[PDB]
Symmetry: C3
């Protein structure tokens, strides 16, 4: 999984280690070993979410296999909202998630692609 979190919280208002705890949570939620999980956090950005510039965060989740249906993603969404609202001290209206299926031929690892690993 590849997670990318953009936020207009300044870095010093994002709890230390958030990227590590989100990595562990994503592994658990998505059913993947942590050594397959990736998290990128980009703080201090200028953002509007749902038309408003109050503190907010956007999460993108891309993965092989597990983020391709509405029913699967509904389940994931509830768990990721629970995690992020509490960590970031944000209301549920200040977070949105986008889900993106990936296939093995798209993922470059150790100088090849996952199709050949």
């Amino acid at each position: 999984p590849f997670l990318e979190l953009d936020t207009n919280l300044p870095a010093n208002r994002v709890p230390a280690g958030l990227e590590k705890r989100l990595c562990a949570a994503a592994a658990s939620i998505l059913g993947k070993p942590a050594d397959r999980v990736n998290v990128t956090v980009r703080p201090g950005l200028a953002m509007a979410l749902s038309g408003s510039t109050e503190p907010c965060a956007q999460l993108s989740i891309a993965s092989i296999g597990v983020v391709g249906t509405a029913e699967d993603n509904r389940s994931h969404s509830a768990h990721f909202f629970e995690f992020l609202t509490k960590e970031l001290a944000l209301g549920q209206d200040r977070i949105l998630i986008r889900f993106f299926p990936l296939e093995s031929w798209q993922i470059g690892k150790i100088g090849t692609v996952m199709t050949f690993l």
Copy 2:
């Protein structure tokens, strides 16, 4: 809609409130209520556009329904180029846009997905 703007203009050379004006413009251009529009601006990056590191901006637009054909995207592109050239004091040659269709099952909102809202 989810708009993401990357620029090598330093933050202090990006007009104040650009994220608000781009949110309002995107609502009008794309035909969506502003409370459904999201904008993220990432300034101060190191960028080449068309092989050149002169000041530039990259805009990504992901939306349900309205960004899936060449004719639709041509219509949006004209308006977004007009808006961004004037805001950023950039020529049309220093801006590129990428359009990405989304579907409801990909959008996590209030702990579910838009398929069920």
Copy 3:
């Protein structure tokens, strides 16, 4: 091509001119004119890669035509891994790549889309 590189290396640990050298390398590797190549570098981020927050980098490569098969991307991966490991002073285990095919109707340029140019 559109290349986007996220890294938790601080900006002052990313060698000067990396975006220029990556632009030139991408033109050669992907077989595209340099004036069609775009590169964005986002340093100083908070990142976990494969569950570890040691220095790392994530590269996304989006392009018309040339990043759509496992066999093409296997070759591109080897070349881009060779480039990024040496430029960033990172081991092969600290970089991943994602490949994203684009089509001409998705690329906004001079107020239209590339379908019409």
